[PDB]
RNA sequence: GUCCUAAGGGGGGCUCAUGGAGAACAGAAAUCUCCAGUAGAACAAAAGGGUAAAAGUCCCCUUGAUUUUGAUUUUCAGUGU
RNA sequence: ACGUACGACCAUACCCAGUGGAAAGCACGGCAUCCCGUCCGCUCUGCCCUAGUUAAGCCACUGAGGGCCCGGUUAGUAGUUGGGUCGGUGACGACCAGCGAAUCCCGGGUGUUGUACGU
């Protein structure tokens, strides 16, 4: 995880970095091997958390592509 | 000296499925052969970036294209357990398809030109069987 | 500025940390000879991309009053001016005017020799491409006076004229023309302006052998009247601003290579 | 032919401006022959161009890119006057001085966005501007009207222009404050 | 009242000479030559494409302060040395002329004693860079299927790096955002002309004969045009500097000077003008 | 040099105009009338200014016109001259060599009357030219037509009299 | 008191005010045509040289209403991603 | 020298009219299947270069009326700064200098030119 972009409930929760469902996070995508049209390597993208991490013990997210 | 390629020369569409094999003609870079998953091979004129021929007859993905060393034949091997030979100057199949492989034909290798005998060429096809 | 285009023009004219390349306005007085106009045309042809041209006759004597010059500079956003004039006392005169904040910073008169003057069209050579800045050579002992004088101001003015657009990189194919100004310390000394095209030949080493061929124009100048800057205005104009990409060095703090 | 010139005093350079300074005197011959004068001047130009080319090809970083062969140039060191004074911070407005005194922080760019979620419609809408939330109900088919407000309402006016009236009053007050700040800053 | 008075004539400001002639868009020319993304002091080349009634003119141009410089030039009437004698303004001739200009540029540069600073300062890890030029269409309309883009396609296939997109070639579909390479190949080899000849010979035989009278006279069938243009492209790539001699009269330059001075009309002298003025005054008095 | 084939007069264009002065159904029906008179969709013109005396408004669609070229223009002008009995006035011809006339009813052109459409008149204006008018109309190298190539009022009157066997009074 | 897929940006086509001569109603003033028209119109500013194949005016595309990154500039930060 | 394509100076080149133009080239021209765009194949775009024509465009020459552009004269004069330097208490009247016009008048002119390919 690179950062926390937007927690939908509260900007204070965004500032505190809370990982709940629907939160937009920034992820390091160096492992996925994404090259832009100009040949540059994209290594940071946005993903949305799709689960309830406080209940699950883990963070599940889906890339916003 | 060969100079490094630095930019796009041409982008030619026409294949309806992913391109699985490609090979230049041994005579020059003017002729290119590609073989795709739309059960066709295609000859391209690379001077103008245009299609030249479409080779049809396979009922599976054309896994391999291979020019003859003298450049007078093109062999295609496909997922339909067959190998076909084509005349690259007319786009027509030479004689009939080659039958006898039970599973997918994966690779082709022409006999070298200086080893040809009995007035014919020989072609090795390696298959999944 | 209700219009977005006028807002863009105002922002272009606004003071900046990294300044725009200077624009030169070429204008003439009520009496201006054909030799002076040809000299002005040659200078404009050398500086086409960042110049504007006036075509009317202006009743301006710059060393008496420069209110119209300040008005023209404010209207056209031109900080360099070339003023052409002619007289019985001064037969062919080019007045270089450099301004600061739409007010006259300094002024210098050049007296052109008519007999030795040759235009660019009088040389049968391949000319400089439009917008290409040339290299520069200043030669002689007249440009190292310990006290600022007319030749020092002439060197500064000619640098501001042939400066062009600054760039951190240059193509090696863009070094084909050189501008040479020669002047010696001493009845008046002659400031000579020449332009040459550059040819390179193999010499058996890594460095090439340079050869020059005359490009034009051919100009002989005598320095005349001078208007020196106010010291406070000079300090304001010679102040240098730091870009945001120039880090202010902190004690014991640095950046590693990663 | 040599590629190095030898002079009693070495050249100085400013490679940001592609400038070579020659301290040595130009011994122009005291002749009336334009031709000998011209190959003397051309020889001086030849030495200057040669030493400039040598300095540029030996003391700068050379990089071969798709654009061409480029020389990394230093920033210019010859002192030249500016055309306009160095920009200075603007005088503080009344709001700016008040906010500095009271410790009021600037709002974040996410905080000041012209977007909000209307839950009644379940839609994203602009707070101000075209079809903004500050003009809500001015195009609705039905508006409830208070009897006292419609009794106190002047003749000719409608309830459909009240929000535009309030917006015009707010804009007028803000514009008056801005003009006062501009006049004070111009006085300073 | 008279609008065209002395005050109007004194106040009048003329346009540029080529603007008055209607030949040059100076608004476009300023951005074509005096505008650059980088400030590397590098020279810039433009491929000028122009069309007349009977010819196609392609030039490779740099801009200097005393006037433009033609690095190389190819004309569609030079395709007669390669075997094309009809349709010297059509799309296939445009493609062939662009290809000829590209091969001439590359052969003049040697990409098919004095030496340059690029060779003087070439690094070990340095590859050959393509020749770069930008298209200059002038006043022509840049619609889809225009022949200026055929000239550009011919030059880019010949080897000149010209920045361009493909949405102005024939066969491009706006809705699907795709290029029909079959239609593009047909237009390159002149098959639109061939289908016109077939359709005209089927429908309107008299119009067919009148329009393609030279084709039938020289026995250029519609089914041979693709082979003719392919052979022309191969011969252009083989020999880009083949000499062509026209059927026009041939004299030397001095002979043409004499021929033109035989028909030039001399300016009247001051003495002759004064004599004519005196004769007019005498005629007015009489 | 007056017998040069490139000086031969011909009809450049014919413009049919209907100025009803009112927007809506009347303009729509006049536009339909022009449509099946010519064979192409007409042009609706907007008012330049607001005139309270004429009851018109700025940017209000008040008139309709069609430009017709070629043999269609020739035959439509022939029908108009048949309506006007091949007779024109000397004031109808302009100094530049063009002419025109007007009709009050459009049934007599050869259009069957329809009760839902109604009555409409129109203005015919025929603009003449010689070959070489492209010199002033092309984009590249746009120039002026020469004075000897310009068309005069006597020339177009003579052309009308010779061509249609008409009378100019 | 009304109306608008907002303004802006890029590209392309076109040339304006006015005058003369013509065209049923139409008559100083409605629309159409030609010619002449250095801008005398429009749009910005307050030229002592703003802009004419445009900076004017109509079409096409975007309209996503204030993007991302920064070890750098200035200010702030008891909530220092 | 002439023509064409890109140009440079941007009226000595502009406004109006008349006469002429070998060669080639420009051009007017011819035709609307395809690409493309219009109320209208007018323009734009595509196809022919055959056929007609120099009538116009273009080029050259001439002509008025304007305009415009060079050079001299005005004239180192008006005007303006300096007790600057002599008188005048002073202001100022000369003188000395520094800068420095324009009107009028006279004479001449109405395009030069780069690169490439051709006639």
Swiss-Prot record, chain B:
Subunit structure: Associates with the pre-60S ribosomal particle. Interacts (via WD repeats) with uL18. Interacts (via UBL domain) with MDN1 (via VWFA/MIDAS domain). Interacts (via WD repeats) with NSA2.
Stated name of the protein: Ribosome assembly protein 4
Family: Belongs to the NLE1/RSA4 family.
Covered range of the whole protein: 131 to 259 of 517
Species this chain originates from: Chaetomium thermophilum (strain DSM 1495 / CBS 144.50 / IMI 039719)
General function of this protein: Involved in ribosome biogenesis. Required for processing and efficient intra-nuclear transport of pre-60S ribosomal subunits. Interacts with the AAA-ATPase Midasin, which is essential for the ATP-dependent dissociation of a group of nonribosomal factors from the pre-60S particle.
Compartment list: Nucleus, Nucleolus
Segments annotated as WD repeats: 14-54, 57-96, 100-129
Curated annotation (Swiss-Prot), chain D:
Pfam families documented for this protein: RRS1 (PF04939)
Cellular localisation: Nucleus
Superkingdom per UniProt: Eukaryota
InterPro entries in alphabetical order: Ribosom_reg (IPR007023)
Protein known as: Ribosome biogenesis regulatory protein homolog
Region called Disordered, residue ranges: 72-93
Function recorded in the entry: Involved in ribosomal large subunit assembly.
Source species: Chaetomium thermophilum (strain DSM 1495 / CBS 144.50 / IMI 039719) (Thermochaetoides thermophila)
Example GO BP: ribosome biogenesis
Listed GO CC annotations: nucleus
Family designation: Belongs to the RRS1 family.
Assigned keywords, A-Z: Nucleus, Ribosome biogenesis
Keyword ATP-binding: no
Main location: nucleus
Subunit structure: Component of a hexameric 5S RNP precursor complex, composed of 5S RNA, RRS1, RPF2, RPL5, RPL11 and SYO1; this complex acts as a precursor for ribosome assembly.
From Swiss-Prot, chain E:
Any GO BP annotation: translation
Pfam families for the chain: Ribosomal_L18_c, Ribosomal_L5e
GO cellular component: cytosolic large ribosomal subunit
Location in the cell: Cytoplasm
Domain of life: Eukaryota
RNA-binding keyword on record: no
InterPro entries per the UniProt record, alphabetical: Rbsml_uL18_euk, Ribosomal_uL18_C_euk
Main location: cytoplasm
Function recorded in the entry: Component of the ribosome, a large ribonucleoprotein complex responsible for the synthesis of proteins in the cell. The small ribosomal subunit (SSU) binds messenger RNAs (mRNAs) and translates the encoded message by selecting cognate aminoacyl-transfer RNA (tRNA) molecules. The large subunit (LSU) contains the ribosomal catalytic site termed the peptidyl transferase center (PTC), which catalyzes the formation of peptide bonds, thereby polymerizing the amino acids delivered by tRNAs into a polypeptide chain.
Family as reported in the entry's similarity comment: Belongs to the universal ribosomal protein uL18 family.
Assembly: Component of a hexameric 5S RNP precursor complex, composed of 5S RNA, RRS1, RPF2, RPL5, RPL11 and SYO1; this complex acts as a precursor for ribosome assembly.
This protein's name: Large ribosomal subunit protein uL18
Organism: Chaetomium thermophilum (strain DSM 1495 / CBS 144.50 / IMI 039719)
From Swiss-Prot, chain F:
Keyword hit for Disulfide bond: no
Keyword Zinc-finger: no
MF annotations from Gene Ontology: structural constituent of ribosome
UniProt entry keywords in alphabetical sequence: Ribonucleoprotein, Ribosomal protein
Assigned GO CC terms: ribonucleoprotein complex; ribosome
InterPro entries registered for this protein in UniProt: Ribosomal_uL5, Ribosomal_uL5_C, Ribosomal_uL5_CS, Ribosomal_uL5_dom_sf, Ribosomal_uL5_N
GO term, biological process aspect, one: translation
Family under the similarity heading: Belongs to the universal ribosomal protein uL5 family.
Biological function: Component of the ribosome, a large ribonucleoprotein complex responsible for the synthesis of proteins in the cell. The small ribosomal subunit (SSU) binds messenger RNAs (mRNAs) and translates the encoded message by selecting cognate aminoacyl-transfer RNA (tRNA) molecules. The large subunit (LSU) contains the ribosomal catalytic site termed the peptidyl transferase center (PTC), which catalyzes the formation of peptide bonds, thereby polymerizing the amino acids delivered by tRNAs into a polypeptide chain.
Subunit structure: Component of a hexameric 5S RNP precursor complex, composed of 5S RNA, RRS1, RPF2, RPL5, RPL11 and SYO1; this complex acts as a precursor for ribosome assembly.
Record-given protein name: Large ribosomal subunit protein uL5
Source organism per UniProt: Chaetomium thermophilum (strain DSM 1495 / CBS 144.50 / IMI 039719)
